[PDB]
Amino acid sequence: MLPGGPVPVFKKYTVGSKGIWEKLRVLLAIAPNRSTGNPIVPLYRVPTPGSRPEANVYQDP
């Protein structure tokens, strides 16, 4: 491979399929590598920007 892909699905941070539906998707997909594009709720934008702990320790650089 090259320094610019391709990369699998279990490293992309998207909401995918689970179970038999994944086997079916990898069967019926032009490129099974590809993602739905919906972000993963636990991770994306968590903790919320108005509750970041890092703002209390922050000091002017």
Partner: protein, 69 residues
């Protein structure tokens, strides 16, 4: 959506993870005045009327008369 009280308008919006119902005490603003929530009353008589908080800059003279004694 104007009917939504503040705090919730920010939690609803993913601005914070903690709701005003569970946000601690020191994080709550102190108020020397009572709270009173009033939505956007546009299209209704309670719509905000603007006005000038000032009075005319050039105050005129209120007449009074004298006699030629």
């Amino acid at each position: 959506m104007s009917q939504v009280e503040p705090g919730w308008h920010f939690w609803l919006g993913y601005g914070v993870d903690t709701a005003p119902c569970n946000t601690p005490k020191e994080k709550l603003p102190i108020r020397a005045y009572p709270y009173k929530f009033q939505p956007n009353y546009t299209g209704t008589p309670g719509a905000f009327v603007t006005y000038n908080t000032l009075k005319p800059k050039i105050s005129a003279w209120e007449p009074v008369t004298k006699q030629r004694s």
